Short mmCIF file of N, CA and C in Angstrom, two decimals:
data_model
loop_
_atom_site.label_atom_id
_atom_site.label_comp_id
_atom_site.label_asym_id
_atom_site.label_seq_id
_atom_site.Cartn_x
_atom_site.Cartn_y
_atom_site.Cartn_z
N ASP A 1 64.79 91.54 57.46
CA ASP A 1 65.12 91.13 58.82
C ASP A 1 65.10 92.24 59.88
N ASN A 2 64.56 91.87 61.05
CA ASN A 2 64.38 92.67 62.27
C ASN A 2 65.72 93.19 62.85
N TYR A 3 66.72 92.31 62.87
CA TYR A 3 68.08 92.59 63.32
C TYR A 3 68.97 93.16 62.20
N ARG A 4 68.42 93.37 61.00
CA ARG A 4 69.15 93.81 59.84
C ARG A 4 70.14 92.76 59.37
N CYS A 5 69.83 91.45 59.57
CA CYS A 5 70.68 90.37 59.09
C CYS A 5 70.46 90.30 57.57
N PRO A 6 71.54 90.23 56.78
CA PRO A 6 71.36 90.03 55.33
C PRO A 6 70.88 88.60 55.02
N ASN A 7 70.20 88.43 53.89
CA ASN A 7 69.74 87.10 53.48
C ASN A 7 70.93 86.39 52.82
N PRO A 8 70.97 85.04 52.76
CA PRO A 8 72.11 84.37 52.11
C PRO A 8 72.30 84.84 50.67
N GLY A 9 73.54 85.16 50.32
CA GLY A 9 73.85 85.70 49.00
C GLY A 9 73.92 87.22 48.97
N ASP A 10 73.42 87.90 50.01
CA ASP A 10 73.47 89.36 50.08
C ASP A 10 74.78 89.87 50.74
N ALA A 11 75.08 91.17 50.60
CA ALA A 11 76.29 91.77 51.19
C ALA A 11 76.25 91.81 52.74
N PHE A 12 77.37 91.46 53.42
CA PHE A 12 77.44 91.56 54.89
C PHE A 12 78.19 92.85 55.24
N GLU A 13 77.43 93.90 55.58
CA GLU A 13 78.00 95.20 55.84
C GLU A 13 78.07 95.49 57.31
N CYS A 14 79.27 95.43 57.84
CA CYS A 14 79.49 95.67 59.24
C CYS A 14 80.73 96.50 59.48
N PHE A 15 80.60 97.59 60.24
CA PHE A 15 81.71 98.47 60.60
C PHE A 15 82.28 97.97 61.92
N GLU A 16 83.53 97.53 61.93
CA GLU A 16 84.16 96.99 63.13
C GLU A 16 84.56 98.05 64.16
N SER A 17 84.18 97.89 65.43
CA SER A 17 84.54 98.82 66.49
C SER A 17 85.40 98.16 67.60
N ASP A 18 85.57 96.81 67.57
CA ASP A 18 86.34 96.10 68.59
C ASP A 18 86.77 94.72 68.06
N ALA A 19 87.75 94.70 67.16
CA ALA A 19 88.26 93.51 66.48
C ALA A 19 88.84 92.47 67.40
N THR A 20 89.50 92.91 68.48
CA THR A 20 90.14 91.99 69.41
C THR A 20 89.22 91.51 70.55
N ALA A 21 87.94 91.90 70.55
CA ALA A 21 87.00 91.45 71.58
C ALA A 21 86.72 89.95 71.34
N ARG A 22 86.87 89.14 72.39
CA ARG A 22 86.57 87.72 72.30
C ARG A 22 85.15 87.46 72.79
N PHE A 23 84.45 86.54 72.13
CA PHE A 23 83.10 86.15 72.54
C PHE A 23 82.89 84.66 72.39
N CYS A 24 82.44 83.99 73.46
CA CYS A 24 82.03 82.60 73.39
C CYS A 24 80.60 82.69 72.89
N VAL A 25 80.33 82.19 71.68
CA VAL A 25 78.99 82.20 71.11
C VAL A 25 78.50 80.76 71.02
N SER A 26 77.18 80.55 71.04
CA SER A 26 76.61 79.21 71.00
C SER A 26 75.38 79.23 70.14
N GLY A 27 75.39 78.44 69.07
CA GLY A 27 74.29 78.37 68.12
C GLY A 27 74.15 76.98 67.54
N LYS A 28 73.71 76.89 66.27
CA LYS A 28 73.43 75.64 65.55
C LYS A 28 74.64 74.75 65.29
N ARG A 29 75.83 75.34 65.22
CA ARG A 29 77.07 74.58 65.01
C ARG A 29 77.87 74.39 66.29
N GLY A 30 77.23 74.55 67.44
CA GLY A 30 77.89 74.40 68.72
C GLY A 30 78.33 75.73 69.30
N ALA A 31 79.15 75.63 70.32
CA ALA A 31 79.69 76.75 71.07
C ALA A 31 81.19 76.82 70.84
N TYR A 32 81.68 78.02 70.51
CA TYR A 32 83.08 78.26 70.21
C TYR A 32 83.42 79.72 70.43
N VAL A 33 84.72 80.00 70.55
CA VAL A 33 85.17 81.38 70.73
C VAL A 33 85.45 82.05 69.40
N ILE A 34 84.90 83.26 69.22
CA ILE A 34 85.20 84.06 68.05
C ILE A 34 85.81 85.40 68.52
N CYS A 35 86.41 86.17 67.58
CA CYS A 35 86.99 87.48 67.83
C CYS A 35 86.29 88.50 66.95
N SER A 36 86.07 89.72 67.49
CA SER A 36 85.48 90.91 66.87
C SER A 36 83.98 90.93 66.94
N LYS A 37 83.41 92.14 67.00
CA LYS A 37 81.98 92.36 67.04
C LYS A 37 81.32 92.00 65.72
N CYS A 38 82.00 92.22 64.58
CA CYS A 38 81.40 91.87 63.29
C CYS A 38 81.26 90.38 63.13
N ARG A 39 82.22 89.60 63.68
CA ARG A 39 82.15 88.15 63.63
C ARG A 39 81.05 87.62 64.53
N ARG A 40 80.83 88.28 65.66
CA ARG A 40 79.78 87.96 66.61
C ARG A 40 78.42 88.18 65.95
N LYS A 41 78.25 89.26 65.20
CA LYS A 41 76.99 89.53 64.49
C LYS A 41 76.80 88.55 63.33
N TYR A 42 77.90 88.18 62.65
CA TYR A 42 77.87 87.21 61.57
C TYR A 42 77.40 85.87 62.10
N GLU A 43 77.93 85.43 63.25
CA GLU A 43 77.51 84.17 63.88
C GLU A 43 76.03 84.15 64.24
N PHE A 44 75.50 85.29 64.69
CA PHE A 44 74.08 85.42 64.98
C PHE A 44 73.26 85.24 63.70
N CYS A 45 73.68 85.86 62.60
CA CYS A 45 72.92 85.79 61.35
C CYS A 45 73.05 84.45 60.62
N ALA A 46 74.25 83.87 60.59
CA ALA A 46 74.48 82.63 59.86
C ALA A 46 74.10 81.37 60.66
N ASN A 47 74.40 81.38 61.97
CA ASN A 47 74.21 80.18 62.77
C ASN A 47 73.31 80.32 63.97
N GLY A 48 72.58 81.44 64.09
CA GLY A 48 71.72 81.70 65.24
C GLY A 48 72.47 81.71 66.55
N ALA A 49 73.79 81.93 66.50
CA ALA A 49 74.64 81.91 67.68
C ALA A 49 74.50 83.17 68.50
N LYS A 50 74.20 82.99 69.76
CA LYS A 50 74.10 84.10 70.68
C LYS A 50 75.26 84.03 71.63
N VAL A 51 75.61 85.15 72.26
CA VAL A 51 76.67 85.18 73.26
C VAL A 51 76.26 84.32 74.45
N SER A 52 77.11 83.38 74.83
CA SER A 52 76.85 82.43 75.90
C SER A 52 76.70 83.08 77.27
N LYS A 53 75.72 82.63 78.06
CA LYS A 53 75.57 83.11 79.43
C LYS A 53 76.49 82.35 80.41
N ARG A 54 77.01 81.17 80.00
CA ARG A 54 77.94 80.35 80.78
C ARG A 54 79.22 80.10 79.94
N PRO A 55 80.02 81.16 79.57
CA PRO A 55 81.20 80.94 78.70
C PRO A 55 82.24 79.95 79.20
N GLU A 56 82.46 79.91 80.53
CA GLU A 56 83.36 78.96 81.19
C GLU A 56 82.86 77.53 80.95
N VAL A 57 81.51 77.33 80.93
CA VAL A 57 80.88 76.04 80.68
C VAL A 57 80.92 75.63 79.19
N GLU A 58 80.34 76.44 78.29
CA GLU A 58 80.21 76.17 76.85
C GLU A 58 81.52 76.15 76.08
N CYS A 59 82.43 77.05 76.44
CA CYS A 59 83.70 77.12 75.76
C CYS A 59 84.78 76.59 76.72
N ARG A 60 85.62 77.44 77.30
CA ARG A 60 86.66 77.05 78.24
C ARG A 60 86.66 78.05 79.38
N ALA A 61 87.31 77.72 80.52
CA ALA A 61 87.46 78.71 81.58
C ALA A 61 88.37 79.87 81.10
N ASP A 62 89.31 79.61 80.18
CA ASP A 62 90.16 80.65 79.61
C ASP A 62 89.75 81.04 78.17
N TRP A 63 88.44 81.11 77.91
CA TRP A 63 87.87 81.48 76.61
C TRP A 63 88.28 82.91 76.19
N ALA A 64 88.52 83.80 77.17
CA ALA A 64 88.86 85.19 76.86
C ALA A 64 90.33 85.38 76.43
N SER A 65 91.18 84.42 76.76
CA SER A 65 92.59 84.47 76.39
C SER A 65 92.90 83.77 75.05
N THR A 66 91.87 83.31 74.33
CA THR A 66 91.99 82.64 73.03
C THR A 66 92.66 83.57 72.03
N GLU A 67 93.68 83.09 71.29
CA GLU A 67 94.33 83.91 70.28
C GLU A 67 93.38 84.16 69.10
N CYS A 68 93.31 85.41 68.62
CA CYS A 68 92.50 85.82 67.47
C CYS A 68 93.25 85.49 66.18
N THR A 69 92.66 84.64 65.35
CA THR A 69 93.26 84.20 64.08
C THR A 69 92.31 84.58 62.94
N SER A 70 92.73 84.42 61.67
CA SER A 70 91.82 84.72 60.55
C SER A 70 90.59 83.79 60.61
N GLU A 71 90.79 82.51 60.96
CA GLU A 71 89.69 81.55 61.11
C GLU A 71 88.58 81.97 62.09
N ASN A 72 88.94 82.40 63.32
CA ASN A 72 87.91 82.80 64.29
C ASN A 72 87.55 84.29 64.24
N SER A 73 88.17 85.07 63.32
CA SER A 73 87.89 86.49 63.22
C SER A 73 87.18 86.95 61.98
N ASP A 74 87.56 86.42 60.82
CA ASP A 74 87.07 86.97 59.55
C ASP A 74 85.61 86.75 59.29
N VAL A 75 85.00 87.73 58.59
CA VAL A 75 83.61 87.66 58.15
C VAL A 75 83.56 87.75 56.64
N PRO A 76 82.77 86.90 55.99
CA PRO A 76 82.68 86.96 54.53
C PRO A 76 82.03 88.26 54.07
N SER A 77 82.47 88.79 52.93
CA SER A 77 81.82 90.00 52.40
C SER A 77 80.36 89.72 51.96
N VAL A 78 79.98 88.44 51.81
CA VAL A 78 78.67 87.99 51.36
C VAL A 78 78.16 86.94 52.35
N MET A 79 76.92 87.11 52.82
CA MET A 79 76.25 86.20 53.75
C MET A 79 76.16 84.78 53.15
N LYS A 80 76.66 83.78 53.88
CA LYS A 80 76.67 82.41 53.38
C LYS A 80 75.38 81.68 53.75
N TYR B 1 76.25 84.34 46.68
CA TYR B 1 77.14 84.07 45.57
C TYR B 1 77.34 82.56 45.42
N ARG B 2 77.02 82.02 44.24
CA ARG B 2 76.99 80.58 43.97
C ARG B 2 78.28 79.93 43.55
N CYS B 3 78.38 78.63 43.80
CA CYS B 3 79.46 77.77 43.33
C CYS B 3 79.29 77.66 41.82
N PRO B 4 80.38 77.70 41.04
CA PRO B 4 80.23 77.60 39.58
C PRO B 4 79.78 76.20 39.14
N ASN B 5 79.11 76.13 37.99
CA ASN B 5 78.66 74.85 37.47
C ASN B 5 79.88 74.15 36.82
N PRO B 6 79.86 72.81 36.63
CA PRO B 6 81.01 72.16 35.98
C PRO B 6 81.32 72.76 34.59
N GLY B 7 82.60 73.04 34.37
CA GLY B 7 83.07 73.67 33.14
C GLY B 7 83.19 75.17 33.25
N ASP B 8 82.50 75.78 34.24
CA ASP B 8 82.54 77.22 34.48
C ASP B 8 83.85 77.61 35.20
N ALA B 9 84.30 78.85 34.94
CA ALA B 9 85.52 79.37 35.54
C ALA B 9 85.37 79.63 37.03
N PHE B 10 86.38 79.26 37.81
CA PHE B 10 86.38 79.55 39.23
C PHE B 10 87.10 80.89 39.31
N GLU B 11 86.33 81.95 39.47
CA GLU B 11 86.88 83.28 39.48
C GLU B 11 86.64 83.86 40.84
N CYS B 12 87.73 84.06 41.55
CA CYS B 12 87.67 84.54 42.89
C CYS B 12 88.74 85.61 43.13
N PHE B 13 88.35 86.75 43.72
CA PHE B 13 89.28 87.80 44.08
C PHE B 13 89.80 87.51 45.49
N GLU B 14 91.11 87.27 45.62
CA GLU B 14 91.71 86.92 46.89
C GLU B 14 91.90 88.15 47.79
N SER B 15 91.43 88.09 49.04
CA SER B 15 91.61 89.18 50.00
C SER B 15 92.47 88.78 51.21
N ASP B 16 92.83 87.47 51.33
CA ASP B 16 93.64 87.00 52.45
C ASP B 16 94.27 85.64 52.08
N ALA B 17 95.28 85.66 51.20
CA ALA B 17 95.99 84.49 50.68
C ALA B 17 96.71 83.68 51.73
N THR B 18 97.19 84.32 52.78
CA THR B 18 97.92 83.63 53.85
C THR B 18 97.03 83.16 54.99
N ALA B 19 95.70 83.33 54.90
CA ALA B 19 94.79 82.89 55.93
C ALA B 19 94.72 81.37 55.94
N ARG B 20 94.94 80.77 57.11
CA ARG B 20 94.89 79.32 57.23
C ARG B 20 93.49 78.92 57.70
N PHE B 21 92.98 77.82 57.16
CA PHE B 21 91.69 77.30 57.57
C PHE B 21 91.71 75.79 57.64
N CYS B 22 91.32 75.23 58.77
CA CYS B 22 91.10 73.81 58.90
C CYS B 22 89.69 73.60 58.34
N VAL B 23 89.56 72.91 57.21
CA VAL B 23 88.26 72.64 56.61
C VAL B 23 87.98 71.13 56.72
N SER B 24 86.70 70.74 56.74
CA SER B 24 86.34 69.34 56.88
C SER B 24 85.16 69.04 55.98
N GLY B 25 85.34 68.10 55.06
CA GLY B 25 84.32 67.73 54.09
C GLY B 25 84.41 66.27 53.70
N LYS B 26 84.06 65.95 52.44
CA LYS B 26 84.02 64.59 51.88
C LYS B 26 85.38 63.88 51.78
N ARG B 27 86.46 64.64 51.69
CA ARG B 27 87.80 64.04 51.63
C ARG B 27 88.55 64.15 52.97
N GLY B 28 87.82 64.36 54.06
CA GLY B 28 88.42 64.50 55.36
C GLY B 28 88.64 65.96 55.74
N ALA B 29 89.42 66.14 56.80
CA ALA B 29 89.76 67.41 57.39
C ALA B 29 91.23 67.67 57.19
N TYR B 30 91.56 68.86 56.70
CA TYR B 30 92.92 69.26 56.43
C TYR B 30 93.04 70.78 56.44
N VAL B 31 94.28 71.27 56.54
CA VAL B 31 94.52 72.71 56.53
C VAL B 31 94.76 73.23 55.12
N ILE B 32 94.06 74.29 54.76
CA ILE B 32 94.27 74.98 53.49
C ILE B 32 94.65 76.44 53.78
N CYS B 33 95.19 77.14 52.76
CA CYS B 33 95.53 78.53 52.88
C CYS B 33 94.73 79.27 51.83
N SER B 34 94.28 80.49 52.17
CA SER B 34 93.58 81.46 51.31
C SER B 34 92.05 81.34 51.31
N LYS B 35 91.37 82.48 51.23
CA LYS B 35 89.91 82.51 51.17
C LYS B 35 89.37 81.88 49.87
N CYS B 36 90.10 82.01 48.76
CA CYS B 36 89.66 81.42 47.50
C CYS B 36 89.72 79.91 47.55
N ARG B 37 90.73 79.36 48.24
CA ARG B 37 90.87 77.91 48.41
C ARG B 37 89.80 77.35 49.35
N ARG B 38 89.42 78.13 50.36
CA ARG B 38 88.39 77.81 51.31
C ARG B 38 87.05 77.73 50.58
N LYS B 39 86.76 78.65 49.65
CA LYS B 39 85.53 78.60 48.86
C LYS B 39 85.55 77.43 47.87
N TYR B 40 86.73 77.14 47.30
CA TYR B 40 86.91 76.02 46.39
C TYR B 40 86.60 74.71 47.12
N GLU B 41 87.11 74.54 48.34
CA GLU B 41 86.86 73.34 49.14
C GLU B 41 85.39 73.14 49.43
N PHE B 42 84.65 74.23 49.69
CA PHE B 42 83.22 74.16 49.89
C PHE B 42 82.53 73.67 48.62
N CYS B 43 82.90 74.20 47.45
CA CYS B 43 82.26 73.83 46.19
C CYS B 43 82.63 72.44 45.67
N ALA B 44 83.88 72.03 45.83
CA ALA B 44 84.33 70.75 45.30
C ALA B 44 84.12 69.61 46.24
N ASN B 45 84.33 69.84 47.54
CA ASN B 45 84.28 68.75 48.52
C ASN B 45 83.30 68.91 49.66
N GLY B 46 82.42 69.91 49.58
CA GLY B 46 81.46 70.18 50.66
C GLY B 46 82.15 70.49 51.98
N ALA B 47 83.41 70.93 51.93
CA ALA B 47 84.18 71.20 53.12
C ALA B 47 83.81 72.53 53.75
N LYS B 48 83.46 72.48 55.01
CA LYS B 48 83.13 73.67 55.77
C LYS B 48 84.25 73.91 56.76
N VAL B 49 84.42 75.16 57.18
CA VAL B 49 85.43 75.50 58.17
C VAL B 49 85.09 74.81 59.49
N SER B 50 86.05 74.08 60.03
CA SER B 50 85.89 73.32 61.26
C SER B 50 85.65 74.18 62.49
N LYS B 51 84.71 73.77 63.35
CA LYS B 51 84.49 74.47 64.62
C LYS B 51 85.47 73.98 65.72
N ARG B 52 86.12 72.81 65.51
CA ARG B 52 87.11 72.23 66.41
C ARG B 52 88.44 71.99 65.62
N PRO B 53 89.11 73.07 65.13
CA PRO B 53 90.33 72.88 64.33
C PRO B 53 91.47 72.10 64.98
N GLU B 54 91.71 72.30 66.27
CA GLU B 54 92.72 71.52 66.98
C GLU B 54 92.31 70.03 67.04
N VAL B 55 91.01 69.73 67.07
CA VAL B 55 90.53 68.35 67.04
C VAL B 55 90.69 67.71 65.62
N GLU B 56 90.02 68.28 64.60
CA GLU B 56 90.00 67.79 63.22
C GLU B 56 91.34 67.83 62.48
N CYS B 57 92.11 68.91 62.68
CA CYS B 57 93.38 69.05 62.01
C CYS B 57 94.56 68.79 62.98
N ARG B 58 95.16 69.80 63.56
CA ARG B 58 96.26 69.65 64.52
C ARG B 58 96.13 70.78 65.52
N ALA B 59 96.80 70.67 66.69
CA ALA B 59 96.81 71.79 67.63
C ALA B 59 97.58 73.00 67.01
N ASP B 60 98.56 72.73 66.13
CA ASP B 60 99.29 73.80 65.45
C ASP B 60 98.84 73.97 63.99
N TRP B 61 97.53 73.84 63.71
CA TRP B 61 96.95 73.98 62.37
C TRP B 61 97.19 75.41 61.80
N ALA B 62 97.28 76.43 62.69
CA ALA B 62 97.43 77.81 62.23
C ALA B 62 98.86 78.16 61.82
N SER B 63 99.84 77.38 62.28
CA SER B 63 101.23 77.60 61.94
C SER B 63 101.69 76.82 60.71
N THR B 64 100.77 76.11 60.02
CA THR B 64 101.03 75.32 58.82
C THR B 64 101.61 76.22 57.75
N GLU B 65 102.70 75.82 57.11
CA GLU B 65 103.26 76.62 56.01
C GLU B 65 102.32 76.53 54.80
N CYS B 66 102.04 77.67 54.15
CA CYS B 66 101.21 77.77 52.94
C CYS B 66 102.03 77.37 51.74
N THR B 67 101.61 76.37 51.02
CA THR B 67 102.34 75.86 49.85
C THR B 67 101.42 75.91 48.63
N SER B 68 101.92 75.60 47.40
CA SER B 68 101.03 75.59 46.23
C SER B 68 100.00 74.46 46.35
N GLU B 69 100.38 73.33 46.98
CA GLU B 69 99.45 72.21 47.19
C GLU B 69 98.25 72.59 48.05
N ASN B 70 98.48 73.29 49.17
CA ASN B 70 97.40 73.64 50.08
C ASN B 70 96.76 75.01 49.79
N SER B 71 97.26 75.74 48.80
CA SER B 71 96.74 77.07 48.46
C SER B 71 96.04 77.19 47.12
N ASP B 72 96.59 76.55 46.08
CA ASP B 72 96.10 76.77 44.72
C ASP B 72 94.71 76.26 44.46
N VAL B 73 94.01 76.98 43.61
CA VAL B 73 92.67 76.67 43.19
C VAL B 73 92.66 76.48 41.67
N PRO B 74 91.99 75.40 41.20
CA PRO B 74 91.83 75.19 39.75
C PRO B 74 91.09 76.35 39.11
N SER B 75 91.47 76.68 37.89
CA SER B 75 90.88 77.79 37.16
C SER B 75 89.47 77.46 36.62
N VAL B 76 89.16 76.17 36.44
CA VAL B 76 87.87 75.71 35.93
C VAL B 76 87.30 74.66 36.90
N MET B 77 86.01 74.80 37.28
CA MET B 77 85.30 73.86 38.15
C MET B 77 84.99 72.57 37.38
N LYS B 78 85.24 71.40 37.98
CA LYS B 78 84.96 70.12 37.31
C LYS B 78 83.63 69.48 37.70
#
């Protein structure tokens, strides 16, 4: 892969530099808010989700104040 | 990493036992605790982590108390 995305079943190796960063991403499973840069890269690789150009539209007007939980933050050690 | 075949051991190393997940599959949408239980739900019930947890489960799905019912995983896949 061009973006260095792992193939399904391979290791997901990402060094986190901003865990509390919120991102409204939009891909194959819809648009939703995630937390951390590693989760943002995981969403790009697993669901083709890119960072939304209209976050207020796709997610919520208060998408940046979303609480970071294990559900919207964690990345699997292995690409699903 | 694959789901075990029926009769095979469900062997999973837990890294976040208290993590809550609203999952939605063949038996509906409900809150489970732990990454190993989340993988079990995917293998047994085709349950994937919900993109609308407040919709599918509850607005307070993340405050759900973790119990043996919503956390435990069978040792052998059926």
